[PDB]
């Protein structure tokens, strides 16, 4: 019930989003 526990795990997929940027780099090429 607060502004603040909704920002803190917004950035959840937000840090993991580098392991799944990834795989698109390895297929860019691939």
Do not use: R
Not at 2 to 12: D, F, H, P, R, S
Not at 13 to 25: C, D, E, G, K
């Amino acid at each position: 019930s607060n502004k603040g526990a909704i920002i803190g795990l917004m950035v959840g997929p937000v840090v993991i989003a580098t392991v799944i940027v990834i795989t698109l780099v390895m297929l860019k090429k691939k």
